[PDB]
Amino acid sequence: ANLVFHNKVIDGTAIKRLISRLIDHFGMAYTSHILDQVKTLGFQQA
Amino acid sequence: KCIKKGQILADGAATVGGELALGKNVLVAYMPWEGYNFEDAVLISECLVYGDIYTSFHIRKYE
């Protein structure tokens, strides 16, 4: 998968932009699974 | 025990030693815990259950 490598910081407006690009590129079924994984990662790190 | 007029004799419910007592003092930490305290959700220990810390009596009248 040709995902860009972010290397600075992921705040609220950055994650919203990434999700919209993931939806437009991968579709909603993929992004729905990505959202579940990213949500799990955020809870675990918090 | 000697008593003056107007001094306490017995404690009612939610009253200890002549003071309103509506709750319990419990050990608390403020931190996120895996989303189980997301927003106003609260995570608790089993010791509050089997310790009977927050057990209450409820009398229902059927007529």
UniProtKB/TrEMBL annotation, chain A:
Protein location: Plastid, Chloroplast
Coiled coil ranges: none
Origin superkingdom: Eukaryota
The family this protein is said to belong to: Belongs to the RNA polymerase beta' chain family. RpoC2 subfamily.
Function: DNA-dependent RNA polymerase catalyzes the transcription of DNA into RNA using the four ribonucleoside triphosphates as substrates.
Quaternary context: In plastids the minimal PEP RNA polymerase catalytic core is composed of four subunits: alpha, beta, beta', and beta''. When a (nuclear-encoded) sigma factor is associated with the core the holoenzyme is formed, which can initiate transcription.
Protein name (Swiss-Prot/TrEMBL): DNA-directed RNA polymerase subunit beta''
Taxonomic classification: Eukaryota, Viridiplantae, Streptophyta, Embryophyta, Tracheophyta
Span of the entire protein shown here: 5 to 50 of 1373
UniProtKB/TrEMBL annotation, chain B:
Subcellular location(s) per record: Plastid, Chloroplast
Transmembrane region(s): none
Function: DNA-dependent RNA polymerase catalyzes the transcription of DNA into RNA using the four ribonucleoside triphosphates as substrates.
Record's subunit section: In plastids the minimal PEP RNA polymerase catalytic core is composed of four subunits: alpha, beta, beta', and beta''. When a (nuclear-encoded) sigma factor is associated with the core the holoenzyme is formed, which can initiate transcription.
Family: Belongs to the RNA polymerase beta chain family.
Annotated protein name in UniProt: DNA-directed RNA polymerase subunit beta
Organism: Sinapis alba
